[PDB]
């Protein structure tokens, strides 16, 4: 796939997109053939040359002065263990990364993206703007505070805690459900047709949740909706 | 004789027969022009590590002995160029035009050839200068999980050394080649490249060159050290060096250990990190100083390579992910960061101010871990908690903006002596900025003395200046 | 004569072949000294220790210095004996490496010095001592609450910046001054920035004249690092065997002796055991500790620091080492911050001598009460931290008072402290501290200002020091 | 009300003392399970490595 | 019958020849140091060196002794300090033995054994009353470091003076100073006249430690088959397990749980199953064994601990927090059991104290609840009062055994409730005084229990205990 | 052999209902390890009382235990074992204390063992 995309980048000079599905299955194949080639084993039954092969393949997938390749990959986390060698070696090559977590998928929050473990080189005050960055980091404080507080709630109970702690749990529930969305490919999985939210709208809405304007609405209204306008109507049907 | 022939070729290892007079650690030359290092010598088979593309070496091709131990090119011409681990130019721009060479397997400076670290390295980061002092000739570990500030902390250090009479080297190991380019253009923009060397080992290269990359970087810095100028070195991941030695050894079929790591791992890292010293006055008073980086998976401080680098250094700066996602930036954990050469690398002024803060942050970490929520506790406990929040907002700092030392001592004098109690926690980040403006326009006399005498001025005058600004602030 | 030649080389490991079949024994030592024949070569001055007889008249060897630069066929010669280091009065006040060479720029020890082996058969059961004896260190906290024993292994666990280097130096001064015995410092795997500071402090404290030091650096291959304890040991053996005096051996960190053993087991090709440690952990550890014994002529006592590998005391390195230890002294930072030196925690330190058969009954009663008094205060401390001193019941105040005086009377004015302060310092015999603490526990001296007890010696000194205030 | 409020505050204080003592005991019991699991994981990985190495 | 050494490394050698060598044979090198043949590969014999291995070099001349591993036995060994091989160590010249026995004996088979019907009185109140041992039993003392293990065994040997027993002490992996000290301690109490001490201290090569327990049972079985009763103590079986792993992982035998070669259970059983009570046809002899295992974290649940908890007829678990809380000896009643016990007590002791072991576990839990508890009831408070006295009645002092007739009398007071009147600290002094009084005044009670192993008339005993209580005074 | 047709519907309904009470108490155990039973409310309190009764009423006196404890043994026929569990599950024996339910064979034996205590 890469030699075809390279010819379009270099000689034709058009910009190009690459979609590679399960680049872990490349790393896994090497292991199977390593023992029969005569190589001694390393770490968790892996080839004695893991970094070297990942580097050769990945260092070709670049955007040169001649032309650009945007490259989008699915990476398989081998045994639900992000501390495994194949993912650890992969994290060193990306510019933006979203990690998907099964605990969120169990709660039904789709897409199940970790809002803390996901990172990009474009979240910089000059690359996205001051208004965008302010809202983004403030959401990340709310969700990290909810994580530590859940331990205290699970053993001692929610009523035991302060008004500021109560207001964090209030907002964090809404923020976490409002990160879920109705896709067009989820037309088959969920009946409902789907939505596209422009960036300006996303910033307005998340700012309202943080400032408390929409806190009167019931929390179930924020699940699988696209724009904040929709959340107001969905609540009306419930009767609020 | 001095000619042999390749019998096995695979994965960047080859095996040769013959070459009877070879030494361990020699350079050997193949027909293709690719170079190599002899690391094993059995009775019939010489074992060769290839330092280049190994897609043109066939079985039965000739290999010939150079006669030199492994040598890296050194000279003043390397400054401002992007280079390979071997002395080969990469930025384009033509040859490096070096004059001489040094071994990459130098002995370290002995006891009786060393002195005591006695002078500072001003990093311009409020937390690193006040709380975790690095002095010239020390070995400091930056250890932490991925995405926590790391390359940010080293790049700030190089820039803040512009005025000082320093030489700095950056050794980029295993990193994607666009990321090294982003740091370089960034350094050319801040004007840093004029006094620095970047040594590059990208992820596409044979493992062996990633292994030599940290040794080549100290071998360049030691040339300037024995000539008398002070030098600083940063290694961009020692965990990526440790992976490349394991691959080379397991293809050379040597016996494993804890996690497939060869039994030489402590010997390899120690040989590299003990070449850091402050030489004595007889040696001309030069100094190396070193900043290894280690990345830890799920913060396993107990892993094989992490247990080993935490030991060889003279301190550590452990960085935490939750502090980052909580607004503390740089995300430096005060409890797990220790310097054992601390107390001598600060200017006389900073030692008096910094001592109280270490006690103050501690009496908050213990109290806060239980009592932040309690609405009313004893009046003291309220006093400690309030100054506790202000201390964690005075230590916060922005990206790519270093602070000169005289201004750091003044803001730390004001928090410690209680001038900042009246100010609320949210505006502590602005009271800071307004104070820096007021000090420049009006208080030129106080700043004159601290730079020249490293000493603090008369208390009445300082109290007068700071109290007067507290009148102006709203 | 006969000679071997080198036939394999890999990192720290080398193999030699001895064609006649006249071969060296399992712990003997071999020299390579060679002058470069052509400008392609590098001159070499290496030495090697034997490890295994592999077969085909070949021998596997670990190397004591860097093996870079070795050509196959290079000749090699056998000394007929293990590594041997010089012993006697010659080695006092000097610094040496594992081999026995002097590292100090203080000349070279001559050929005539008697040189004796690192490896030797261990002491026998017809040679040891029937009755335990207690060693008087002159330090109040140590002699009262965790008595040291002649022939004992003592363990120091403490944090950085608590007084370790001062406590080691004061012990070396008290034993040399009062009991008339030398000391040895063997730094196994030590950072070269610490060795320099230690040599300057040992010199500037005046202690140097009574001690001999071996330094094995971190940058040495594992075999040198492992056998550095075995040379410091063989020097202390001459002083017990011949001069008959009692001797003291300090080991910088025993964990690095076990780590170097693991790294040599991996180079040599052995199968790892639990937690990836050598398959011969307790035969290595035992063959070190079983030479630190109190024979009839005299004794060796040892203070050894140990690192807990992961804060896990159930690990195979702590397990094997703690099997041999007789006392444990732990140093606390809180006390240090407050002003107590020596900074030793009375409630986390242990001895096997603190039993009424060895110490006698008067000492045992006095000691237990001190521990009972201090522990109760640690409880009232959190009550006094939350609420006021008036709130305590009267009986509880009668325990607060005694505890504060007892905590301070543990503090002592050292002689090596006069570089860090301006006062002379004192030595206290065990009978005088046992008598004094009995007076404090009966309350005879409670009419006194608190700080009267700070950094003092005998209890009668408190009386006079009180008058000084008024 | 005087007796009621005084008795309520004392009841929370012992309930809190016993709760803290149960939690600290559970921390030592759990800590030992973590160390036994950590040492077994490091003896499995080294035996699989050496088993493949002995075969090849 | 001649071979030649090809590899000599790590304590295991190999040799080329020795054609008629039997497996298990003792092998003599040219040097005169000894060895055991354990393996016979087609051209090479594999030899374990049983001595210092630094004098043997490839090219040496191993020779064949002609005898299977054999340990010297005879009456002359009693009172001497000896090696695992029959070699004298104390000085004092030769051992002057007469004959030998294999160290690889079979255990007395079924139909050659009987049930236990005679006591092994330890003179320790908690062990004799709560966790009984009879001749022929295999009993495990388990614990952590510094809990009382050597102290309980040595108290047993001194008290087995009066009774016609032979006692053997086998010190495996111990520091040499502790062993020399034990011999002087036994000589002072006069114990050495009827005992053998067998030594394998830590500086020696691992093979003589592995053989050390098998030499100790091989000496004791000679006396057993001749009819006299014997006891054996093993000072660390967990250090025997460690030395077997080191010897196996050097012969490249594959690992397992921990890294223990699977043949740990077979090793421990081969030793422990030679303990037996022979029947009257065999002359009614007896071995008995008290193996010791140390446990990490003071946790009963671990590999080598559970393996020996399988081979024995009970266990005595000693606890470190009890030890630091003044309870000495420090015995946990709930986790300590005797499976052959119930027949091994004298008749008076069965009647006096059989419900003590189970009732005392109940106090341990009810005390733990009561401290955190606020208000208790009368039937819980009465149980809490007797439990405190029992714990002080089971406290003893070092090197002071109590004769069994005196044990049943002090326990009768506690179970029948006469001791309820006395305040707690006084219980230890009340016990020293009652024993003195029994000696001076109450001789008739002490004559009856010894001959009939039986308890006297209740009226006379109740009269006597009230008469002592009048004479006793308090605080 | 636990299937309606093999055991009869009465035995099957009794066995499944006993296993449901025991699983709820293996989850309540995580919270009662720390706080005790103040945190528990309503159904949690009633479930822990009945689980304590059930867990001790599964313990028996054996004829082979006579060599260890002086008690005589008991044989409980199947029709009797099912009847006892049902009365425990209904709550007909809520008043009797937990120490009377240990080491016995039939429900009649628990009533006389309670009467010996009088609690
Ligand atoms: N002091 C700071 N203030 C604000 N943002 C910061 C600061 N330091 C780092 N960051 C930001 O956080 C991230 C730090 O990335 P950086 O490359 O410094 O970490 P790293 O550990 O080198 O990452 P990697 O593991 O990918 O090498 C970037 O988004 C950066 O802009
Ligand atoms: N009943 C007792 N009363 C008083 N002191 C005792 C008693 N039992 C043992 N001790 C003392 O307590 C310590 C126990 O050591 P001992 O050797 O008995 O324990 P151990 O478990 O065998 O030790 P180790 O694990 O070191 O081999 C010794 O000082 C011993 O003399
Ligand atoms: N006995 C003492 N009397 C006075 N000051 C002391 C004493 N012991 C230590 N100190 C002080 O504490 C410091 C501790 O330094 P040092 O013992 O070298 O630390 P470390 O434990 O890291 O080796 C001393 O240099 C001195 O400042
Ligand atoms: Mg980086
Ligand atoms: Mg020190
Ligand atoms: Mg013992």
PDB file of N, CA and C and ligand atoms in Angstrom, chain C residues 164-165 194 198, ligand 5:
ATOM      1  N   UNK C 164      25.000   9.417  58.442  1.00  0.00           N
ATOM      2  CA  UNK C 164      25.668   8.129  58.267  1.00  0.00           C
ATOM      3  C   UNK C 164      27.191   8.260  58.312  1.00  0.00           C
ATOM      4  N   UNK C 165      27.719   9.211  57.566  1.00  0.00           N
ATOM      5  CA  UNK C 165      29.158   9.396  57.459  1.00  0.00           C
ATOM      6  C   UNK C 165      29.767   9.835  58.788  1.00  0.00           C
ATOM      7  N   UNK C 194      31.567  10.304  45.504  1.00  0.00           N
ATOM      8  CA  UNK C 194      31.505  10.008  46.931  1.00  0.00           C
ATOM      9  C   UNK C 194      32.861   9.583  47.478  1.00  0.00           C
ATOM     10  N   UNK C 198      34.668  11.421  50.651  1.00  0.00           N
ATOM     11  CA  UNK C 198      35.044  10.550  51.755  1.00  0.00           C
ATOM     12  C   UNK C 198      36.535  10.621  52.062  1.00  0.00           C
TER      13      UNK C 198
HETATM   14 MG1  LIG G   5      27.810   8.970  52.925  1.00  0.00          MG
END
